[PDB]
Design a protein around this ligand. Structure first.
Ligand SMILES: CCCCCCCCCCCCCCCCCC(=O)OC[C@H](COP(=O)([O-])OCC[N+](C)(C)C)OC(=O)CCCCCCCCCCCCCCCCC
Ligand SMILES: CCCCCCCCCCCCCCCCCC(=O)OC[C@H](COP(=O)(O)OCCN)OC(=O)CCCCCCCCCCCCCCCCC
Ligand SMILES: CCCCCCCCCCCCCCCCCC(=O)OC[C@H](COP(=O)(O)OCCN)OC(=O)CCCCCCCCCCCCCCCCC
Ligand SMILES: CCCCCCCCCCCCCCCCCC(=O)O[C@@H](COC(=O)CCCCCCCCCCCCCCC)COP(=O)(O)OC[C@H](O)CO
Ligand SMILES: CCCCCCCCCCC[C@H](O)CC(=O)SCCNC(=O)CCNC(=O)[C@H](O)C(C)(C)COP(=O)(O)O
Lengths: 606, 156, 86, 128, 127, 12, 172, 459
């Protein structure tokens, strides 16, 4: 009966009000976006009181409510499980999306369907709002599928863009391929554990969850854009920037990693799956990062940075560090949202140009935008006591002194250095140097919407690292006594990577020619994955459906096995039995055989 | 509008019927080419080179600009693989064989080294995580009636 | 952004044309069919339209570029392609 | 010199690298000259209907109608049963069906065998 | 090279018609014309209130628009949710379950007024 | 400067 | 109809520099390497033999293919560009306006009345423009896709309505 | 049940006795009233069927199906007065008569207590559907379709006839009750296998089952819109309904004599959904989608599992509502452009803003998006099948992947994209089309709140 239950539940329902009021249309269509932001702002403000209540006493509770059906022995009911992962995530997601909503007013200002756009963002927000809070697997599926379909429209928001539909279809495809593991986990838990509530799965102690956890891993990889199922995130860059900064920065793609954190107690029981997560987390962390540093599009650059970060999340959850992985979720939410939003500022202000090889010299042109990026870039890459410090090097330190895959440890270190690599590429090409954009300048950021939204997230990137790290109760054993020379590798590799990348970037400043390196061809072409794996399997499967399936099987053979064979036989026997010659001689002679043989060899006498 | 005879028919056997089909398909006898009839039933429909709509020159103005077709032009039998959003046969800057070699090599190299990493794992020169209460048999999920086996941790 | 019109286009068009070193400042006329008036080889018009492009930031098709040969012609082509109605 | 660009059915050969377009023979002079002739014939008609004020309906495309007919009923009247089609039908037909039967029957036989001797954990598995 | 005489004349009229056609795409000052809409008492109240437009008029305007947002989007929704959570759904067993109140050795508990004992003598180490 | 926008009739 | 040798090499020139944008990036590097490209293009002007020119461009295309940038800098308002057809889901065609409702129609009387003016002009110009088209049509069907312009006074050029009344590139 | 059959029968003079132009109104309003009376039967007692008399009975299996048919009846009526208005008074009057004779047979079929009485009306639905397809069908191939439809289901139904009469003379009674209580173990004798084949094949043909499914792409493509939905929305379920009812005497021969059908279905769904990945015709695309979803129910039924049965009926009705709806989507676009090709009409979201929505959550419901009962049906079958065999998920899971790719594909091609230049006859959508779409969407999502009224007797 504590108030905690009441207000925290309203955090969902008050968020849904703009959706209900939207269909009324009594709202002035001009003032709708302001209405949406204020509701989310109040949603965040109300979302505070559960958080301080959680830090004060530390109580985690479940709100089970209206009983959907008593499914024989199953009792599927709408139930909002809440714990530290919930109560911490809720303010973070609301804070980011409120800042994005404020920015979206500035960026998406000329779109006639801007009110529809704010409707979609709220619909996505509540969808992930119920994704994080899900006591039963079915509610987890509600968010897990609604969040994918909500992305489909939003990525194809510009609609008529032919490539945008491709990315929208591509996003659904990879997500639903991952969803195959989800329903596999669904069936396993219902059959071998007789429930979908997290309480029963934890308590029944499925200590040998080899099949479910593989399905859980496969479900995680689809939504988190892991290696093998990564390229949907880089391709889903064709939507508007606020779409990018909210869903495809840290508030949709993170759902895949968040899935295993919810199922962490079962994860530690098994060992094979954890090593697989160590394998998948490492390869995603480097391969995407390797394909990043050679790109010339901020949306592609920052996206690949997410997937590399998403790869980093899978590493820490791998070696029994679930909470710190969720800490990495919150910190990554802060600075990564700013980077896209900051990149959104420069893209629109400089007449919707996204190629990094054309902007040039934005340092003193846009002070706040340049200021935001360097703080965001430093936080993502290191800079102790900043937001990234309370998460990243702790993960790197934690993964160092653990019985991990020796190769996977090597990928994390290199990718950690590669994290600074593309960070330099953005700062060096865009802001530093001489400008290259078209002669007519339109550089401006004085709009209060852009300045306030950046500043709101900026103060988060300075202090929110220290706040929650000092506020949440210690949920992991610490690592205190290691040699000095791997306690510092997190700083060393980033500082080391900062060095040559700067030197190699100003090697472009060197007047001499640059050879078309083959390895550069491999990395700049997204690691060769899209040019083959989006062209070889799709062609074969599409070719199989036409040549086989449609033509050969359905309407060539199956129509000839039963229908045409019987029709041909009936017609063939019809042409003979009805083509009598009309001569009385042959008719009576036919009777004579019938009369003779009837009183004969058929033995029609005994 | 169109009459029945203009509908696609059987294989053009004689060159004269090849010309008739080419006229029927709004092409000439030079570029007309029926599909190789291995019994698959393609009929007289003229096979065309594998050219996705992405291949077609975007700067040219089409009657159907979205898919890059003009009115009446005999579209490919395999249009729906080769539409703008479906399978695209655009020429990559590097060869497909090289395209495939580096992809398979990197994946195989990554997987192989991952195995050898597992063979020789990395760890610090540190030992077991000593745990009290006979390895916490009771709270690990153990049964109270079955007393835990002798487990104890020492000091030096 | 305030949309561009002819006096904007024409001034920007003769802007980059004047900035070209070999073009004589007094020889600059909106109606000047390049080579027959200002000695410019066929390899030069294909490269100055890039300067014409970068002035307005929208790609000039080569089919239209080869036809595009006069300072007035560039102004006319730019305006209609960017729905400039004044 | 860098290695050349070998073509593929999925990675086509560009027009810029094709040897055929290099030598424009006088035979090819007219071969690619009627391209615009037939295209204009189709063009001029198309704009005439498209721009026609009296037109209110849609302009029927005989190529589109022909394509739908070719990818439809007009396939079996052109279907000749041959070993290629016969083997293709069996390989993509009965083939996978029997293969799926083999894997399922084998697993199901193994599945019930374990239950027969009580070699499977279904203590909590009650809903079915 | 170079619009041909017929072609340059073709583009000239095409440009001329296009300019005139886009000129018609303008809007007259009177457009758009629209029938009136039923006015609201609060809206007309704020119109006559905001005629002064002084800074202290704007704050109460903004405060009120923040106030009625709070009541109709937080106060009422939290009312029905709490009522639902306090007299309807909690009236069924095991509907709202929470973690046990985490107590520590040394403090005291409420429902019996008993003290869990103080943590016994620590081996007394220091750094 | 304001100018006419074409839009499919939503009145129905 | 046929891209002559000069047309193809200029096309090679334009695409070569555009790819070299993505390589050189910085403007100072651009103005140097472009000049080498220009200078080394000027040297083979007196090549005389056209066969050599094909051989002079034979290695050129593949050399471009050797050094082609995997991510060339394509312009946003162009095919392959980021803002390609993006501003198109709002340019509903003009003919849709005929299906409007009188209450909607009465909102914009002046524009609608002027649209009717354009409507009648198209109706009056059609017979003249279709007649003009056939009176100088080439034998054996149209040979070149280019259409005849308006020859006499008053008459509008044939096939003009959709070109003139095309939706604006920035409808919003 | 006479509270439903009698008003339905008395509605037949109602239409014929109506005036010239009032036929559509009176038929619609009273059919909707008949639907309301049908909802009076949704309450099923604890574990007993709502047995009314020896002639008619109802349980939780036919309770949702019956009201689906009655609810359907206005929808064909609401989807017919577009192309039928250009016809004489009699022919329009005749058209309404047939559908009402259609639903009357369907109402009698689902409520029949005796398998023979079930059988008679079960084939009798052919007669009105056949004439509807042939008479008012707007195509040429429909003449071949009528033969293809009639013979194919009859070729399986006729062997069924000999099966029932054999049961009657051997076991005794043949009603749905005595069979269940007096059920005896079926032996493994080869004669019993043939009786199993006879008692089953007739129902699989009407589902249809992969291979025996070619009569849907013929019938549905060029059937009239009104006849297209009913044949798609219930007549397929009619084959489904008999599957639960008749698999009470076929035990335990079901376990061994089901493998060929499970393999045909679990592979057919991948193949048939692979059909849907590429269809030149929108209506053919929808028809093949019905094959895949129905093939799920065949797998669902043949396992004969509690969880499987509730998922079967939930998917059965849910598919019918959405499949009928998508057919209405095809009819609207086909009406404007007078063709069926995919790529001919495209970019229709810009031209028609609301229809972009209607086709949108129609695709989502077709996609089994949770919690839409399409999901609660498909997901149940996966769980039941996975318990039956762990490799079932590899195929049946891959269906949801393939089902997504084609479902959005028709949404991408038709609604999204650029408007077709030459097409200019697309007027603003009439409120009849918009309303008819809502009459499908709203009950679907409304019923999501209470799946217990669709989960069947096994719930
Ligand atoms: C106290 C009660 C307050 C008012 C409740 C009003 C209703 C409601 O919201 O109930 C919530 C209840 C919730 O149940 P509950 O267990 O939470 O209890 C409710 C009481 N409180 C809130 C206090 C706990 O759910 C239902 O009643 C289910 C409603 C389902 C509605 C289905 C409509 C179907 C319409 C079909 C039309 C088409 C027919 C033809 C076609 C058929 C298909 C083929
Ligand atoms: C133990 C600690 C190890 C720490 C290693 C730190 C490495 C940091 C990264 C260095 C190489 C990448 C780099 O410098 O990228 C920046 C830059 C981009 O150059 P480019 O993309 O060609 O653009 C030129 C535009 N005029 O310049 C470049 O040269 C880009 C080169 C692209 C290919 C880089 C391949 C790096 C592979 C690293 C190992 C991967 C796993 C094996
Ligand atoms: C480990 C890896 C497992 C497999 C992962 C997925 C493999 C790829 C599946 C398709 C990916 C999306 C796709 O369709 O890509 C092709 C194309 C977009 O291609 P893209 O390179 O993005 O270029 C866009 C335009 N510039 O987009 C389109 O063509 C969209 C429309 C057609 C989509 C058809 C997709 C059919 C896929 C069938 C796969 C069956 C086999 C799956 C095997 C693995 C299963 C886990
Ligand atoms: C298009 C072809 C058909 C499609 C598939 C339909 C289903 C396949 C099987 C069809 C079976 C039809 C005949 C079954 C009648 C009822 C079956 C029955 O009651 O079971 C009996 C099964 O017994 C039979 O012999 C039934 C017939 C077996 C199959 C032979 C005839 C059917 C196949 C040929 C005719 C149908 C095909 C069409 C040909 C143009 C049990 O009786 P019993 O044999 O035990 O009787 C006691 C004693 O032993 C003496 O009888
Ligand atoms: C730094 C870079 C290193 C890497 C460098 C890499 C260089 C790669 C490209 C090498 C290019 C090659 O040398 C020459 C070729 O391809 S094609 C020559 C054109 N010659 C003709 O086609 C003959 C007929 N002539 C004409 O048509 C007119 O003369 C012309 C239009 C050309 C000029 O007209 P005007 O103007 O004068």
């Amino acid at each position: 009966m504590n108030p905690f239950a009441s207000l925290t539940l309203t955090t969902l329902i008050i968020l849904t009000i703009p959706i209900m009021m939207s269909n009324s249309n009594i709202y002035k269509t001009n003032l709708y976006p302001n209405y949406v932001k204020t509701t989310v702002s109040y949603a965040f403000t109300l979302s505070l009181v559960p958080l301080l209540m959680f830090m004060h006493t530390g109580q985690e509770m479940i709100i089970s409510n209206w009983h959907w059906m008593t499914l024989q022995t199953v009792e599927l009911s709408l139930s909002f499980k809440m714990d530290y992962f919930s109560v911490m995530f809720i303010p973070v997601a609301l804070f980011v999306t409120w800042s994005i909503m404020e920015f979206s007013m500035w960026y998406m200002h000329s779109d006639p369907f801007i009110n529809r756009f704010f409707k979609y963002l709220v619909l996505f927000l509540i969808t992930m709002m119920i994704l994080v809070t899900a006591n039963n697997l079915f509610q987890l599926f509600i968010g897990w599928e609604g969040v994918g379909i909500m992305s489909f429209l939003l990525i194809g928001w510009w609609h008529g863009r032919t490539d945008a539909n491709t990315a929208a279809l591509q996003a659904i495809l990879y997500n639903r391929i991952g969803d195959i593991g989800f329903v596999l986990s669904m069936a396993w838990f219902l059959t071998h554990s007789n429930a979908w509530d997290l309480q029963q799965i934890f308590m029944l102690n499925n200590e040998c969850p080899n099949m479910p956890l593989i399905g859980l891993l496969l479900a995680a990889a689809g939504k988190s854009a892991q290696f093998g199922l990564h390229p949907w995130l880089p391709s889903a860059m064709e939507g508007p920037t606020p779409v990018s900064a909210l869903l495809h920065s840290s508030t949709m793609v993170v759902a895949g990693v968040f899935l295993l954190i919810r199922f962490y107690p079962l994860m530690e029981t098994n060992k094979l799956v954890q090593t697989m997560t160590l394998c998948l987390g490492a390869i995603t962390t480097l391969f995407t990062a390797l394909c990043a540093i050679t790109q010339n599009d901020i949306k592609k650059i920052v996206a690949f940075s997410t997937s590399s970060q998403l790869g980093l999340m899978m590493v820490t959850i791998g070696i029994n560090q679930p909470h710190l992985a969720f800490l990495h979720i919150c910190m990554h939410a802060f600075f990564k949202a700013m980077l896209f939003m900051c990149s959104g500022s420069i893209i629109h202000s400089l007449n919707d140009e996204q190629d990094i090889r054309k902007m040039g010299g934005l340092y003193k042109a846009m002070p706040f935008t340049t200021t935001a990026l360097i703080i965001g870039s430093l936080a993502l890459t290191g800079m102790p006591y900043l937001t990234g410090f309370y998460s990243k090097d702790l993960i790197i330190e934690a993964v160092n002194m653990s019985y991990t895959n020796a190769w996977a440890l090597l990928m994390t270190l290199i990718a950690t250095s590669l994290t600074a690599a593309y960070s330099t590429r953005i700062i060096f090409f865009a802001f530093l140097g001489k400008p290259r954009f078209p002669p007519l300048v339109l550089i401006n950021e004085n709009n209060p919407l852009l300045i306030n939204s950046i500043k709101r997230l900026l103060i988060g990137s300075i202090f929110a690292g220290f706040i929650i790290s000092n506020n949440i109760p210690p949920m992991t054993v610490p690592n205190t006594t290691m040699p000095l020379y791997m306690k510092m590798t997190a700083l060393i590799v980033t500082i080391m990577g900062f060095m040559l990348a700067l030197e190699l970037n100003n090697t472009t400043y060197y007047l001499k020619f640059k050879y078309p390196s083959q390895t550069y061809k491999f990395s700049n072409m997204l690691g060769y994955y899209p040019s083959i794996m989006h062209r070889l399997p799709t062609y074969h499967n599409l070719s199989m459906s036409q040549k086989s399936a449609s033509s050969l099987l359905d309407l060539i053979w199956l129509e000839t096995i039963l229908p045409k064979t019987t029709s041909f036989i009936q017609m063939k026997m019809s042409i003979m039995v009805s083509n009598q010659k009309g001569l009385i001689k042959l008719y009576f002679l036919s009777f004579l055989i019938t009369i003779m043989i009837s009183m004969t060899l058929f033995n029609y006498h005994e | 509008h169109v009459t029945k005879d203009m509908f696609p028919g059987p294989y053009p056997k004689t060159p004269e019927e090849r010309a008739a089909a080419a006229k029927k398909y709004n092409m000439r006898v030079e570029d007309y080419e029926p599909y190789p009839d291995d019994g698959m039933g393609y009929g007289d429909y003229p096979k065309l080179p594998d050219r996705s709509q992405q291949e077609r020159d975007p700067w040219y103005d089409w009657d159907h600009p979205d898919l890059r077709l003009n009115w009446g032009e005999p579209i490919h039998w395999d249009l729906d693989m080769y539409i703008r959003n479906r399978v695209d046969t655009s020429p990559t800057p590097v060869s497909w064989n090289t395209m495939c070699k580096h992809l398979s090599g990197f994946v195989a190299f990554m997987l192989f080294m991952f195995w050898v990493g597992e063979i020789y794992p990395s760890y610090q020169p540190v030992g077991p995580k000593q745990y009290p209460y006979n390895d916490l048999y009771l709270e690990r999920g153990g049964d109270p009636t079955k007393e835990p086996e002798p487990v104890v941790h020492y000091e030096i | 952004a305030p949309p561009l019109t002819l006096e904007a286009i024409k001034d920007r068009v003769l802007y980059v044309l004047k900035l070209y070193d070999k073009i004589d400042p007094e020889k600059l006329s909106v109606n000047s069919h390049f080579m027959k008036d200002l000695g410019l080889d066929s390899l030069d018009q294909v490269e100055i339209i890039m300067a014409m492009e970068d002035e307005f930031g929208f790609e000039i098709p080569d089919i239209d570029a080869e036809k595009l040969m006069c300072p007035q012609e560039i102004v006319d082509y730019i305006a209609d392609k960017k729905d400039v109605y004044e | 010199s860098f290695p050349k660009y070998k073509p593929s059915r999925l990675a086509t050969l560009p027009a810029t690298l094709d040897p055929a377009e290099y030598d424009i023979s006088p035979e090819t002079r007219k071969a690619q000259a009627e391209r615009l002739a037939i295209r204009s014939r189709l063009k001029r008609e198309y704009l005439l209907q498209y721009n026609d004020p009296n037109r209110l309906g849609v302009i029927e495309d005989p190529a589109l109608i022909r394509w739908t007919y070719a990818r439809s009923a007009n396939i079996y009247p052109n279907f000749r049963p041959t070993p290629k089609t016969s083997l293709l039908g069996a390989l993509f037909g009965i083939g996978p069906l029997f293969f799926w039967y083999y894997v399922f029957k084998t697993d199901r036989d193994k599945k019930e065998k374990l239950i027969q001797e009580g070699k499977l954990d279904q203590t909590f598995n009650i809903s079915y | 090279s170079g619009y041909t005489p017929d072609e340059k004349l073709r583009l000239q009229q095409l440009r001329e018609l296009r300019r005139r056609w886009l000129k018609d795409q303008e809007l007259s000052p009177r457009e758009p014309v629209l029938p009136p809409r039923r006015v609201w008492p609060m809206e007309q109240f704020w119109n006559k209130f905001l005629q002064d437009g002084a800074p202290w008029k704007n704050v109460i305007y903004k405060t009120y628009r923040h106030s009625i947002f709070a009541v109709t989007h937080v106060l009422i929704p939290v009312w029905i949710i709490h009522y639902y959570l306090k007299y309807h759904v909690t009236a069924k067993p095991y509907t709202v379950v929470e973690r046990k109140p985490r107590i520590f050795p040394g403090d005291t508990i409420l429902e019996t007024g008993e003290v869990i004992p103080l943590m016994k003598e620590f081996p007394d180490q220091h750094h | 400067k304001r100018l006419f926008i074409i839009k499919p009739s939503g009145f129905y | 109809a046929y891209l002559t040798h000069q047309q193809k090499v200029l096309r090679l020139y334009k695409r070569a520099l555009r790819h070299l944008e993505s390589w050189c990036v910085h403007r100072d590097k651009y103005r140097y390497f472009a000049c080498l490209m220009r200078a080394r293009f000027d040297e083979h002007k007196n090549e005389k033999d056209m066969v050599k020119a094909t051989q002079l461009l034979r290695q050129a295309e593949e050399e471009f293919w050797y050094g082609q940038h995997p991510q060339p800098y394509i312009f946003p308002e162009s095919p392959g560009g980021t803002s390609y057809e993006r501003y198109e889901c709002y340019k509903v065609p003009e003919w849709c306006l005929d299906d409007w409702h009188p209450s909607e129609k009465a909102m914009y009387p002046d524009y609608f009345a002027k649209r009717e003016q354009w409507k009648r002009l198209r109706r009056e110009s059609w017979e003249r423009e279709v007649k003009q088209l056939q009176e100088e049509t080439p034998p054996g069907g149209p040979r070149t896709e280019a259409l005849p312009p308006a020859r006499k006074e008053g008459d509008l050029p044939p096939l003009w309505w959709h070109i003139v009344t095309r939706p604006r590139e920035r409808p919003m | 049940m006479l509270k439903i059959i009698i008003p339905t029968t008395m509605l037949l003079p109602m239409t014929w006795m109506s005036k010239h132009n009032m036929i559509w109104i009176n038929a619609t309003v009273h059919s909707l009233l008949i639907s309301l009376i049908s909802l009076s039967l949704l309450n099923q007692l604890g574990e007993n069927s709502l047995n009314f008399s020896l002639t008619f009975f109802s349980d939780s299996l036919s309770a949702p199906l019956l009201v689906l048919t009655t609810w359907l009846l206005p929808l064909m009526l609401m989807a017919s007065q577009s192309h039928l208005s250009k016809e004489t008074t009699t022919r329009k009057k005749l058209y309404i008569t047939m559908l009402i004779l259609l639903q009357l047979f369907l109402i009698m079929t689902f409520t029949a207590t005796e398998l023979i009485l079930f059988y008679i009306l079960f084939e009798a639905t052919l007669v009105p559907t056949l004439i509807i397809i042939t008479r008012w069908g707007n195509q040429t191939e429909r003449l071949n379709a009528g033969l293809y439809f009639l013979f194919y289901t009859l070729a399986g139904s006729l062997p069924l006839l000999v099966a029932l009469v054999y049961i009657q003379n051997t076991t005794g009674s043949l009603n749905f009750l005595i069979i269940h209580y007096w059920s005896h173990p079926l032996s493994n004798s080869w004669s019993n296998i043939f009786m199993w084949l006879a008692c089953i094949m007739a129902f699989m043909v009407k589902m249809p089952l992969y291979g025996l499914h070619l009569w849907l792409p013929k019938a549905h493509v060029e059937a009239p819109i009104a006849g297209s939905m009913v044949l798609a929305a219930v007549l397929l379920k009619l084959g489904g309904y008999g599957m639960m009812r008749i698999t009470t005497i076929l035990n335990p021969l079901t376990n061994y004599m089901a493998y060929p059908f499970l393999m045909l279905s679990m592979w057919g769904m991948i193949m048939t959904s692979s059909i849907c990945l590429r269809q030149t015709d929108l209506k053919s695309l929808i028809a093949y989608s019905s094959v895949s979803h129905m093939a799920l129910v065949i797998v669902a039924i043949m396992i004969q599992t509690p969880w499987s049965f509730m998922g079967a009926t939930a998917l059965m009705i849910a598919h019918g509502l959405t499949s009928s709806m998508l057919f209405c989507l095809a009819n609207t676009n086909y009406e404007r452009v007078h063709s069926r090709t995919m790529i001919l009409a495209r970019g229709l979201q810009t031209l028609l803003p609301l229809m972009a929505t209607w086709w949108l959550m129609a695709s989502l419901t077709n996609l089994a998006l949770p919690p839409s009962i399409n999901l609660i049906g498909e997901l149940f079958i996966i769980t039941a099948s996975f318990s039956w065999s762990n490799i079932t998920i590899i195929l049946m899971g891959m269906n949801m992947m393939i089902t997504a790719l084609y479902s959005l594909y028709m949404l991408i091609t038709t609604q999204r994209g650029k408007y077709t230049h030459h097409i200019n006859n697309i007027k603003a959508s009439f409120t009849r089309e918009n309303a008819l779409m809502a009459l499908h969407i709203l009950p679907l999502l409304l019923l999501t709140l209470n799946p217990k009224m669709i989960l069947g007797p096994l719930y």
